[PDB]
Symmetry: C5
Subunit: 213 residues, 5 copies
């Protein structure tokens, strides 16, 4: 206790200084662009509906970005290096699947981890239905599917996207899924439209899969 | 540092426009024109036992409010910004013959530009009334649904399209259904119940089972 | 030009702010100040009849009308505004409910009303309803008959009286390619008395006879 | 008129009343020193469905809830003779009466509004659709299937919340005449239970239904 | 009638002092132990087309904060109380291999005791990754799902069970599935990326079609 009481007190002081003086960060702009790193950890192809061409995925989607406005000096806060906080208390990026066919279902607590250098890690678990023809899922080559993820409203001048590796993390893939993974890549792409001079960034999730035996 | 002066300018801009009374919507004396456009991504499902068809599309909405205007020079050259759709008024555009609530697939964020213009592009899945008869045939099926304001007549909201062609350039190439044609047409209507003019955009889609 | 537009806009702000205060939300009807709600249905589709569970699914506009002194204003003090649109959450709405649904109603329309300067309100929620209905004989010429009551969940006739403007359901919107065709569709006010109580209960009983399209 | 005045004055009596019970003053719930009796009663409307590949049955019913709070009493003569009012269920405390063996969330089908009367008593009657645990084995027979589900507080033991019924017969005067399922019997019975783990009594109302396919 | 007003004002008084005269979650300095146990009511559905299985259970969560302590003597000898689960902090315990959002079957209400202990027992319906193959045989099928904080390491939240027995005394005797065995076991996990320990409770269930 006491120190415990003071530890608590430090965090609460940190949280208020960060949030309640200087209202919420207004998102990136062309002047103050931001890079968002994404990585997918695929857990499960739950279902492949060949009457509709929809496949359902369960995955953890890791988001990392970093904001100056969220740094503090740990020395000033009883040496708190980082803390967990609700996603409602901070700006999060608007990363969406560009071809889902149902609202994404969130499977995990909406809480992020923020570090003293202003970097935020946020890892939502999701079930997604997206546009995918599962033809050849019963063959040796299996079926191939793709879905792009990106910011819904920000172009490349405000949000840049990157990955650590083009390899999707399969280390958590359900061993007894109806389907088995031949490959899972996650690839940064730059889209140019003719309408518009600004580039748009997405990460392309490509999965090649196949009925298990 | 300069990066912190931009944030500050934006925060200030948003506060001026939002924290200092939300537009109460259009009036006969002060009507609004909303531009609509569809980008058909997919016909996911044709249900011949209930006559329901499920579409996924982007729905572009565009409009312009004087009270959303600023002079960029007083805000460090900011020419536009992105903000939650909750912060502004948005039009009550709806499908007139859906059979399930629409399912919003994209985040509710809008871009506001310094001339007061707003662009909002919700992705949707919609079930609407549609007889898919003929879909298994060279000529395919034709379906139609209308969109417009739910509570404003054409004295308050007028609608408009940029082209009467649905944008099909992201239509999903391995859909169960290919598209023969897809058109979005402004229409003005007079109903016996109701003496005000009614404006809608008619979405007409001819489609067949892929081969 | 932009100046005419700003005053008219500010006159609406003013009207709203004046109505939605002094003296905030009207507490609902009483025995001393009862209220009459007119309903009318506009049937768009019988989407589905499930004979394995005896549930049928209707899509309709449920048109509701009523009048509140508390929502009156003089157009003259408000730059000639005779009516305006407002989210239904800003005002009191009646608790009209199907008595025999089997799923929560799904709302298919923005929930916004029209208030006119005499205090009258017009509110048109579009709905999809699953209600108890045995669709037997639907595949014959004489078809099936199903019925559902709508009324206030909690007010007696001493507080909310219902009426219809007509006993016919409005079919002008009915989908010409539904699996189901309408033979008749009526909407009739009924007064019920129970045995617990001395107060009457009012409902509009919606009766639909339908069959498969051939 | 001086009717348009009286009306105006009936509204202000109600708005005032609501203001004195609601803003001025919110029951923190029952306690061991201040227990509460909840009266429960069912009006069964329909057995909508019986899944025998999962052993779920879906019922539709209205659940009558009734209790009384000193803190909700008022003197009608101070309030223009108002003897009772309607109000959103969110303005008042309500009991956590729950099904103990539901299998998906209860579906509410009626507006959440209660009636409060000057003696401090509240009647609240939500219509609901419940999926609960039930084998319909033998539903296609003469003798039928039996199912049970208990209802009662989720977190209050009998020392804080007690339950009673006005009758043991579930009310069937609104059962749907053309349901797939007719009702052989439906009863609603107060049970008291005592566990080893625990000194306190546990109250529930046991809802039991014998039904068979309509034939 | 007057001592009921008293004891009532006392509780109100307590809730005031606890909740608005006044937890930001646990930390490395101030860690917290959550005790969990499961009461399994039903395996509703085992789906071989998708490899999902649906359970109905009560999940007891139990923990203790110094900040919720009080001295009964100063509060009419109130020894505990019930309160909405939004009035207080709760731990982010999460199934790590669910495939649908958990559905809540019970009122979101907790019991707070004067020593600052909190007990929270939500009823849930869950879908999780489970191959039901063999459920039709005598040896049944076996499925596991781990449960843990999503965002805190072992440095801030530790977990425990009072028993590794999943309590089956309320199992639905008429389920389609009979439980062969059901356990709930703490697990510590050490990774290559990370010095932090990671704790979960592993819910493992062996079950077969009822005979
Ligand atoms: C299958 O859909 C429709 C089918 C048919 C029609 C309109 C439809 O629907 C659409 C419906 C509106 C607007 C644009 C549409 O494209 C309706 C409307 C509405 C309002 C107020 C009302 O009373 C005061 C009312 O009756 C209304 O409903 C009508 C009015 C006329 C008709 C039917 C329903 C006949 C019209 N005719 C040619 C037959 C074919 C205000 C706003 N809303 C709610 C939008
Ligand atoms: Mg740009
Ligand atoms: Mg008009
Ligand atoms: Mg006409
Ligand atoms: Mg008008
Ligand atoms: Mg009465
Ligand atoms: Mg009465
Ligand atoms: Mg007790
Ligand atoms: Mg107790
Ligand atoms: Mg850690
Ligand atoms: Mg840490």
């Amino acid at each position: 206790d006491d120190d415990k009481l003071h530890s608590q007190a430090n965090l609460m002081r940190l949280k208020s200084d960060l949030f309640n003086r200087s209202p919420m960060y207004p998102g990136p702009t062309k002047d103050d662009p931001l890079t968002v790193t994404l990585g997918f950890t695929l857990q499960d192809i739950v279902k492949a509906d060949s009457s509709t061409n929809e496949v359902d995925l369960v995955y953890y989607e890791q988001q990392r970005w970093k904001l100056n406005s969220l740094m503090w000096d740990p020395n000033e806060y009883g040496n708190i290096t980082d803390f967990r906080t609700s996603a409602a208390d901070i700006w999060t990026p608007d990363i969406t699947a560009y071809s889902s066919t149902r609202p994404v279902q969130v499977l995990s607590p909406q809480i992020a981890v923020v570090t003293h250098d202003g970097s935020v890690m946020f890892i939502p678990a999701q079930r997604l239905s997206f546009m995918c023809d599962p033809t050849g899922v019963d063959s040796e080559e299996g079926a191939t599917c793709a879905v792009k993820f990106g910011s819904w409203v920000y172009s490349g001048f405000e949000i840049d996207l990157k990955t650590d590796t083009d390899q999707v993390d399969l280390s958590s893939y359900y061993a007894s899924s109806k389907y088995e993974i031949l490959s899972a890549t996650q690839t940064r792409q730059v889209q140019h439209y003719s309408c518009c001079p600004e580039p748009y960034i997405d990460v392309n999730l490509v999965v090649k899969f196949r009925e298990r035996r």
